[PDB]
Each structure stands twice: as structure tokens, then as C-alpha cells.
Amino acid sequence: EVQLQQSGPELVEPGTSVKMPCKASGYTFTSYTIQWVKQTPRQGLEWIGYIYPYNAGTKYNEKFKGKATLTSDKSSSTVYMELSSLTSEDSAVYYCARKSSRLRSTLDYWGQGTSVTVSGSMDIKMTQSPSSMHASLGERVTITCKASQDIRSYLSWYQQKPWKSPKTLIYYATSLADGVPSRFSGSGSGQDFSLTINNLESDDTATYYCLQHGESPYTFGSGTKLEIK
Amino acid sequence: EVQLQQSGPELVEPGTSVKMPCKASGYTFTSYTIQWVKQTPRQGLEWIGYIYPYNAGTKYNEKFKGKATLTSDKSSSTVYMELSSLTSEDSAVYYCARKSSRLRSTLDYWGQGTSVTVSSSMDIKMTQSPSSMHASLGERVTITCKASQDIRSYLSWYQQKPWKSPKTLIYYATSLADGVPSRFSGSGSGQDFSLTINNLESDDTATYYCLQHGESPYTFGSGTKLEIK
Amino acid sequence: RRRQGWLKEIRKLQKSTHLLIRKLPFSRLAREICVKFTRGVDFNWQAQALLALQEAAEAFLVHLFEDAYLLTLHAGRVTLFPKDVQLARRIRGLEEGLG
Amino acid sequence: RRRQGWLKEIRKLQKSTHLLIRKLPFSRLAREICVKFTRGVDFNWQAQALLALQEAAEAFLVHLFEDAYLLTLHAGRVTLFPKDVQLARRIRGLEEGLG
Amino acid sequence: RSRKESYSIYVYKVLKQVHPDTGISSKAMGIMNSFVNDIFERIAGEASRLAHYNKRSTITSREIQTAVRLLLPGELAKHAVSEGTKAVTKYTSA
Amino acid sequence: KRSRKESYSIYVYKVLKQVHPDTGISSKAMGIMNSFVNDIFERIAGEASRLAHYNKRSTITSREIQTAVRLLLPGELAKHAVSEGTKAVTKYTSA
Amino acid sequence: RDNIQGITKPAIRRLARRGGVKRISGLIYEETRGVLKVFLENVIRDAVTYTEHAKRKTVTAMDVVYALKRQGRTLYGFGG
Amino acid sequence: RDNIQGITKPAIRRLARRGGVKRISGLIYEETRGVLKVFLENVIRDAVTYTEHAKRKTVTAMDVVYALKRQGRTLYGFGG
Amino acid sequence: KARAKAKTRSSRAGLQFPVGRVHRLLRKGNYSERVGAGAPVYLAAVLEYLTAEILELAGNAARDNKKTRIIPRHLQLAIRNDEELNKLLGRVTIAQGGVLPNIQAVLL
Amino acid sequence: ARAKAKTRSSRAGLQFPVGRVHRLLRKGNYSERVGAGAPVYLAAVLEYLTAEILELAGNAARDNKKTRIIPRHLQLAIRNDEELNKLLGRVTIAQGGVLPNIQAVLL
DNA sequence: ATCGGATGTATATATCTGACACGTGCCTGGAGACTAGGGAGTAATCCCCTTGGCGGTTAAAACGCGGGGGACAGCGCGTACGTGCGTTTAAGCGGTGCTAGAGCTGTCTACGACCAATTGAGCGGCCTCGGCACCGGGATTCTCGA
DNA sequence: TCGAGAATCCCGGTGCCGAGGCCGCTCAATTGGTCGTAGACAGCTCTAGCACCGCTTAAACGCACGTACGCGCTGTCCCCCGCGTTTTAACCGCCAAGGGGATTACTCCCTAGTCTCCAGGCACGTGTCAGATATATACATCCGAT
């Protein structure tokens, strides 16, 4: 299968620089961009940037210009990320995710995560209306992701169990991802979207994020933590 | 058009070597073999050999094996012929002729010849049945070229004005060459072949040769001198 | 005091899209090549036909120079030689190369 | 006592016509490549299918080695390097090159 | 003069739905027209070859699906198969 | 029960027995000659089909086959194949 | 033991000597295994598509011949 | 002055700089003129074969597009 | 004689590309003896998807150039900067498209 | 009651089947109509190309002291001819081998 | 590491023209509705050919080692290519004019699809001997070392 | 410039299995009429391609020169090839089983075909705004000097 082997955690001091690899396997390495996501437990998931190894073309978030630098290596099928001038704000988990160059594709496969431990208004805000909810073991659950501007259908949904990488449930606001059962169902277009889980199981307790990728900085949702009985 | 420029007349002394060029133009150089014919007024026309510049592959007449050596040059589109150990029986005109690699093709275009003057058997025999003929300016002359073993229609016909290069009339024993009027018509298959000319003129005063190319040494006929009254 | 301007020339030519051979020499070169196939008869040419022929010929020549310069840099040189162009035509095959 | 036998090896391998890769390693390599496309289901293979696949693969590899050795001799070397194979795959294009 | 059909109005409708404030020049419209004709001929020729290999007389949506799967590389084939499948399944339920 | 399974083997053998009356052919080379005949048939018929479609014709005639032979075969190969096809069409029309 | 290592370096050396190569770097063998795996993936994916369209579970020689023919790599001698 | 000499040294130099070539030997101009002549004979012969089959005496843009398309050199933007 | 008002087959499929024209071109193009009903729908959907993908990438490339109109240069930049589209249109020349600005790194 | 059946191949002087080529042109989805002289022309061209390749391969077999054409002889016949190598350019002949070609700088 | 000056690159403003996007009439090609028939889906059956296993043989792969061939870095020399500048010369643009030929339309007839009956050409099955691969012994020709 | 050794080539004998010939049959090609339409041909109209001329101006051309760079030579060290020994796995023969390919029969749904009718799409105008070009301004970058 597609694996994105990421390195282990670091314990560094400020002013240092860290290179974290994202050695990929199981697919044609140049055909897919490799995205980088930062997860702090204060602001949730933030999109750093990507690199397209087909032409070494990058695009960064404006919040990470100068701080992040992406390089690729076609020989080892490896993408690196440098973090220059480390502050206390830079202590998080950094996932690398594989996204195809097609516009309706989303971040399909994620790396395990690298935990770094150190010693903007014109974007699109994703507003998840329930910040948390509690559910039974077979009833209905509906999460919404009302947007700021008009993304067309470029919205995907993710499930992240704690201390694990996020898993893609739904892309293109309705289409099921690979290996996802039909209990998950997405709807909506324009500015309001919805994710419905039809018959809850014991392992459907996680945080559920929505990601838009319709405009130039990609913005995740704030999150929705679902507990069950 | 297709033209094979050849060097001028050369006077030499015995014992040495001479290398004559056959600079060709007007066609793709590697697609065609370049044949070499020697014309004495003692044995008629004799086929020396060829070189195929696509792979520099040669094939010599065993009468001239060791005596001659053909080389090519793709940069200048030139074929050379070296005549080593110039004995007194080498005083002849040496034509270079272009022939396709196709089996029914014949020696289409000829060079003007280099008159080389040195200053002192399991083959196919072509027997032209008239040796000299005379006719007025309107009747019908027929020359026959009965072969010895068997040639499956691989016979061509050439005419030669005095001190000129030969010109192709018929190939594949019946087919008209390019630019030849329909007065000339060949016929025959197997071992017996014939060329008939229908309405003679004064330009039809030449020597008429038949050439077989069905077996590995190519053999010309003895010749037939047609004089128009 | 002579400065190098090959880099400025490459940077402006790689962002321009216009035709690099003049139209009137290419037109009569194409007509002279055409008269040798139509048995001496001269054919007419639409203006879009000569434009399409020139766009295809210049795209072919530009892409052949890109492939032949990789052979220049492979041999340690920086100057494009005719042996680079001949080898690039040989490796491309009979259809992408020859012709 | 060591004399060169690369020339004898080249001369006998260029006049032979048999397959150079052993049949059973190629067969199980092609089967494990096939099982990654058939949703984990094992497909059957005719014997002539694996023979046709091996003939095509060996002809492809021999022609790519010829094209890459032209690049080896272009650079003045006599030893075939992986950069020669990568450049020969790049110049052949997307269809004649990769894959 | 004849009628001289093209794909320009459909390409323009698709452009107005993916980029509502973007126009297109007439030279780029001719390139888009040539692209649509070329991909049509590629898919239809491959589907004709697939129907002939299996001794079938009909080109169905199954032949078009496997021709799209043979001709388009990568995720392009996956999303094109998704688009064609949803169009066929909402066409038959009408 | 077994099917028809047509091939060109008897015609390739008839041609070989008149260009080389004592040479034979192996069954592995006969399959290569069969693949060659099918490939050249498909090439010429596809080019003639496209030639009839470009000119808004519905019939493939011997003119389309002649033009497809001139487009596909390189060099003197096309010249001699046009000669052979024209000779066969002339002999067929007279009989 | 991987199956790509069944393409041994004597076999790669024989394929190179049939291609006329005099000396071979030691890094050629992994490059050749990668090139062969890319070629086999491209051909076998199309052959499996041809097999699955016919609703068969057996890759025939005609499927391989069609998969090669649609990539500009016509093979004579296995039917068609 | 032959018509192949109308493809001047600055035009060949501009075609090479668009190809990214930094330095250019003086023997490349005759090589480029020969390559351009071979390409043009191959395309123009097929385009004339398409024109003569249509019983026309005017080479159209579609004839050039078909002549390029049958050599694996599809051109967008001139019809078809 | 209660004949309903005609709905195009593009509207039943939810498409912009013409299903009836694609059906006529499939029937008159000498592809098969018969054409199924779902084949022009599937083909028109695939052609609409590919056109939309190229046009959206070219509109993004035109917006990065601060242009509001797509020219052939923007289509060339959209196609050659994408590996799958460059592989699909591999042996395709786009007129007035230019080349990618690719200078070799050993020269600088 | 009717005349004796003559094949269209013997009427055209061919060894290749004119009626089979006509049926393959009708059933091959090339056009809706096929002229009467089109399978004659096509069968003549196919017979010419088959005869050219078989004669070159028979000469290559006779040069190797053999009376039977194998795939190696077809490969040697095709690759030693520029027009036939250009026609079968993207064609792999199974069990045909390669041309003996060592580069001159190695010797 | 720092300072001054020419200049390439990026940015805002004007203005201008021609191409693009929109509106309209019409006509022809797509849709609606209906019928007929055959292509293909599906089920059942048969046999064939693919997979799996076992045992032994032996040729090929693997491994280690040593020597020398060759890759690569550096250096010096000479030549050929870029650059700049002044002269020249053909490309291009407008403007006119002419006419060949592309494109359309109407007539008509030859030719190809179609159909039914018949037969013989080609394909499957089978049967046999000779071309070729292999093996073993003898004549011919290049090579390192005195 | 020669001598044991290696390489290559030639010739006789053996066996085998595949090429080539023969026979039965069946289905696909031939024959003989019929019918309708595709295309050949004549004629006519008008587009667009060719041909010429003046003029301008940008591009090509020629030459001189400095220096960047190709190319040959040299030395070092490292890595590839040949060789000998041991390990291993491909291969071949025999055998069994069963999955699935291929064939056959039946039915019915789907698609070609026909007629009617209307609205989608195309030619044709037409007005305006996006992009090209020119100009002025500021930001940044290299080149020389220190």
C-alpha cells in the first residue's frame, strides 16, 4: 500500500533547525504533491505548504514564509522540511500528507507524525457548529462545516483518533474515500456542508475535522470531538 | 533530382592505388546501395560490387575480391572505391550506380564515369542473340537475352550512347523505368527475355545491355549495337 | 567591459511565445520543398497551412535542442556540438528522431 | 593469467536468441506485480502470456542498454553508469522512456 | 457555407461554471476544441478496439469505462470514471 | 468442440514456395509472418478509413488503399507495392 | 527474499552484454531492477484491465499482446 | 542564395536559446538546417499526399495537421 | 398527440457537453455497429471532466499572471506543470504556447 | 446450372485471399461500403510485402547453411534493410535476437 | 564586511483598438413515441490447462580476492565563440488587382449491399521422415614470450 | 620473428520431434439478380491566394578582440572483472485436481429505424473593455572600490 514513513520525535532548544523526512513508498513519487500539516492542541490543524516533486514547485502558507522550507529528493523518494529559528510556538506534531495534483483530490494518506518538542485575514474560516457532542451506539450524528467564502465542492472530512494520524473519510464534499464504509455520508455545496454518520460503532469516537482546499491557503476546521456511550 | 557526381579522368602508373569518389545527392543517402560497374571494350560491362551505407555492408564479385575495396562516408554522402595493385588490365571506365535495397529494383541512376588509364565459373551467362542490328527509322526491333540457369524475372535493360553513362529502360523484365517512353517494352520470364522497340528514331542509336540481378554475382549481357539508317 | 547576456536572452525567449524564424524565408523554403513532390507543379498554400507548418517545425527544433543540450552537459561540455544533435536524434528513434 | 572474455561473451550473446532471465524468477515477479492490481485476487496466467511478457521485457532492457551505452561512449567513459540509463530514459520520452 | 459544428459553447459553459469572471481568447478556444476532438477519438477508438477484441457489436458504457481506464493516467482516470458513473446513474434514473 | 481459428499460413506458404521453392519455414516464424500480415492489414485499413472520413466519403476504394500505401510504406517499398496493387486491379477488372 | 532480487546480476550482466556493454558499474543492477519493475507494472496493469473487461480470471497471451500494442511496443509471434 | 540559407544564424540561435542552450558551436547551423530540411520534407510529402487524394491544388491547414498527426506530432489550434 | 416538451439528454445527465451530438459522432464515426444508450452519456461526462480540469488550471495560471483571459500560453503552463496532463498530452504541440522556463542548474 | 466458381484471387493473379480480405474489410468497422477493387489492391500489397520479407529471410537462411526460416532469419532480414526497419520500427520479433553490433571504439 | 552608482526588474497611469461576448433569425439536427428483431445476458455443461507438489540433478549463482584498467581531478595551451558596433538589406505592411480554384448544387447511373442457393477451399486431425541440435574428432589461424 | 596453446571452423554420425503432406467435412466464398443511393461530373459563384510596388525600420551581416572553454596530458586510487570454490535454486519429469474457459441454448431487453416537430446551435452583426504599448516612478541588485 501507500506508506509515508516519517521520522521519530525530537527534543530540541530554540534557534536550532530541524529536518524531518517524509520517505514515501508504494506509488509513483513524482505524480503526487506532499503536503505538510502542523497540529498544535491550541489552534488545531494548520496547513504549512506543499512541494510538487515533479518540478520541485512549492507553495507555502503566508504564516510560514521563511520558517518552513521544503525540498525533495527523487532518488530516495523523500521530502524534507526545514524549521528555521525555532520558537516556543513551534512545538507540535508535523504530519506529511500525500495529495494528488488533481483539484478534487484531497490529502489521502498521512504519515505517522513527527513530534517536535522545543525547550492572514483574507483566508477562509471553517466554522464547525458543534464543538463537541455525545451520542448513543446506533443513533444519528450530523456535523456541519459552514464556510466563509464560496468554495465550490473542494471540502474533505477527516477522522483523527487521539495519538494517531488523521484518516480521510469523504472528499469532494460527497464522495467516499477508499476503504470508508457507507455509514459516513457527506452533503452540501457553496458555503454549508454536512457530515452524517448513520449507525455508530464503538470505534467511531474521534475528532472530526473539515478541510477546504478551494482557495490558495488550505484551512482546516476547528474540530468536533465525538464521544459515545 | 538524383545525381551521382564522379571524378574526372585519371592517369596513373602501375603498382600504386587510386581512390575515386561517388558523391551522391538528391536522395536519402543510406536507403540505397551504391553499385560499381567496370566497362572495358574487351569484356563489356562487369559488376564489381556494392556497399550499403545504412550498415556499411559490402558484397564483392569474387573476380574483384582483394582487388577492390568500397568504403562510405555518411557525413559527405560519398562512396569511395580503392583499386589496389593496378595491373595493366585495369584500363577502363568505372561507373557508380544507385540501386535500392528492394529485390526487383535495378541500377537506376549512374555516374558519368572515371576513365582510369594505367600507363604500362558457377555463374549466370547472359547471351544476347543479336550482336549488331540495323534498321530504318520506323520499324520494330527485338533483342533477346536468354539466360543460363534461371532468374525469376530479375532482369533489367540498359541503353548506352557512346561515351555516355548507361540509362535504364526496363526493370523487372517488363516494367518501364522513370522517364522512359512506352515505345520500349520488355517481356519474358524464367530464362528467355526480350526487349522490343516499336517506333525508332535517331536517338535510339546506342548499345543495349541486359543485366540480371537474380543471383549473387550480377552479370551483364554481351551487348547489341543498334544503328539507325 | 563585456557582460554576459545569454542568460537575459534565454529568460526573455523562454517567456515569449512568438515564432522565431521569419515568415517569408520559411514560406519559400516550404514551397521549394513542396515543388519537388508535386511533379513540378506548384501548389497553392493556405496562410494557416504555412503557419501550422512553422509552429510544428519550431516546436520540433526547440525540443530537439533541449534534448541535445542534456548530452552536452552529460559530456562535461557547455558548448552544443553537432554530435550532440546527432546522438539525440539517434536515441529518440525513427519517428521522434529521424525527421 | 587473465585475458579479456567480455568480447567473447558479447559475441556469443549477440548471436544467441534465447531468453536471458530465468523463467521462474521472472514468473513469480510478474505474479506479485499482478496481485497488486487484481484487488488481492490471484489471477491465472497462461504460459504463453508469461513468455510474451518476458520476451517484451528482455527486448526493452537490451535496447535500453544499447541506448545508454551510446551515452556512456559520448561522455568518454567505457563503464555504463546509472546516469546514462536515466538520461537515455529521459531522451526517449514518456512512452519510449519510462516504462 | 456549411454549418461547421464545434464545442465552443460547451467549453464556454464549463469555463463559466469553473471560473465565472474569466474569459478565453479565440486561439485558446481552438486549442480546447482540438483537445476535445482528440480525446474523443482516442476513447472511441480504444472502445472500438475493446468491442472488437471481445467479439461484441455494441459500444456500451462498460467499454467507455475500460477505455478511459486504459487511456487516462493516474488519478485522472479515477475521477473521470467517477464522473461518468455518476452521470450514467443519474441519467438512467430519469 | 473447437472453433474456426483462421490464419494466413497457407498463403504465406504458397508465397514462400514460389520465392524459395526448397526453403521451408518453422511454425514459430509462421506465427511471426501471420502477426506481420495482420499488423500491416490493420495499418493500411485504418489509414484508408481515416482517408475516407477526412474526405466525407463512405466507401473505401482502391484509391484510398493506394493513398494509404503511399502514406505508410517508406521509400521504394511504396512504389513497388503501388505497382503490384495497380497490376492486380488491372488484371482483375479485365477478367 | 524479494522477488525483484530474482533478477540476478548475472542476468542483468547478460542483458547488458547482449546490448554490447563492455564494463558495468555496480550501481547498474538496482537501477535495472527499478526500470524493469516500472516496465512490468505499466504492461501488467493494462493486461489486467483487458482481462477484467473480458470477465476472465486468466491473463491470456492476447491480453499481454494488446497491452504492449497500445503502448507502441508491438510483439510478433504470440497471436494476432 | 539558397532558400535554406534564409534560416539565418540569429534564428537558429534564438531557437537554441529558447531550448536553454548557453553556448553554441559554429558547426550547429548547417546541422540545424539539415535537420529542419529533413523534418520539412517528411511533413510536406505527407501533406501533399493528403491534398492530391482530395483532388485539390491547395495545401490546407487540415492537410498539415493530418500529416503531423500521422507522424505522432499532434498539433492543437489549427482545426480538428 | 399529448407529446411532452423535449428535454435534452445533457440535462437528464446533469452535463453541459452535448449527449446527442456525442451519440451522433459515435454512430457516424465507424466505431461499432451499435452504440449503447449509456455510452454517449459516459463519454460526454469524461470529456466535460477533462475540459473542466484543464480550464480550471489554465484560469488559475491566468490569474497568477494578473490576466482575466485564457491565452494558449496559460493552457501550455497548465498542461506542462502537471505530470498526468503532460503524460496525456505527451506528443501534442500547442500552438503559440511556448516552452516552460527551464534553465539547467549547472549553468548558473 | 451456373458457371464454375473461380476465386477472386485467381482472377486477380494473387496467392492471398481476396474474399477473406473483403470480409475482414466489411466486418472491421472501417467504412460502411467497400469497393470491389479495394480487397484486390490490399491483398496484392500484402502479398508483395510478404514475398519481400520471405525472400530476404530465405537468403539469410541460405547464408547460414539452413533450409528453414526461423525467427532469427526474419530479424536479420528486417533489421538489415532501412525501409523494412523503418516500417517495423516499433516491433519486437520474438526469439529474433539482436543485430551483432559492437561499437568500434571498444575494439 | 561596507558604500556609491548604473541599471535590470517591478509597478501605476494613459490611451487605443480590435477581438470577444452578447443579441437575433432561422433551420436542421436532436427528441418523443412507436415498432421489430437480434445481441447479449444467463444458466448449464464439458474438458483442458493451470496450479501445486515431490524428488533428484546439475548448471548457474554467490562469494571472496587480487590485480590492473579506468574514472576523475587538476593543469596548461590554443582556438573559437560571444559581444559590440557600424553598415546593409531583406522582411513586413499597406494597398491594389486578378483569377484560379474551393465549395456548393443538381443529374444521373454505375456500383455495392443484400439475399438465396451451391460447392469447394481451408481447417482440424493424424501420421511420417528428415533438418537440426548435439557430440566427437581433425584442419586452420591468432597470441604471448623467447 | 617463431612455438605451445587457445580459438574457430569443418565434417561424420544419432536421434527426435516438428514440419509437411493427406483426408474428411463444413462453412464461407462464389454466382446470379435486384435495388437504391453514393459519388462522378458539369456548371457556377465568390473567396482567398498570388503577384507587384514603395518604404521603412528592424534585423541580419561583417569584423575585431578578449577570454571562456575544449582538449590533451598526467597521476592517483578505487572499483570492476576474472577465477576458483561452494551453495542453491531453477528445471525437468510425473502426477493429480479442479477452476475456469469455451461452447450451446433460450429469452427478452435494448437499440436501430421511422416519422414528426420544435428549439438548440450557428452565422451574422455590434458595441465595449482587456491587453498591448508608452511613460514615469521606485525598489533592489550587481559592479567597482575600500
Author numbering:
A (entry chain N): 23 to 141, 156 to 265
B (entry chain M): 23 to 142, 157 to 265
C (entry chain A), D (entry chain E): 42 to 140
E (entry chain H): 31 to 124
F (entry chain D): 30 to 124
G (entry chain F), H (entry chain B): 23 to 102
I (entry chain G): 9 to 116
J (entry chain C): 10 to 116
Question: What do the authors of the reporting publication say about this deposited model?
Answer:
Nucleosomes are substrates of the protein machineries responsible for DNA replication, recombination, transcription, repair, and chromosome segregation. Single particle cryo-EM provides an alternative way to determine atomic resolution structures without requiring crystals; however, nucleosomes tend to dissociate during cryogenic sample preparation, which apparently limits the resolution of structures of NCPs determined. Here, we overcome this hurdle by using a single-chain antibody fragment (scFv) to stabilize the nucleosome. In this work, we demonstrate that the scFv can be used to stabilize nucleosomes for determination of atomic resolution native-like nucleosome structures by cryo-EM.
We also solved the structure of the scFv-NCPCENP-A, W601 complex at a resolution of 2.63 Å. NCPCENP-A, W601 and NCPCENP-A, NAS showed similar structures at the DNA ends but displayed substantial conformational differences in super-helical location (SHL) 1 to 2. It appears that the DNA conformation at the SHL 1 to 3 region is more variable than those at other locations. Intriguingly, this region is also the binding site of the ATPase domain of chromatin remodeling enzymes. Moreover, the C-terminal tail of CENP-A with residues LEEGLG were well resolved in both NCPCENP-A, W601 and NCPCENP-A, NAS cryo-EM structures. The two Leu residues form similar hydrophobic interactions with each other compared to analogous Ile and Leu residues in the structure of NCPH3-IEEGLG, W601 in complex with the CENP-C motif.
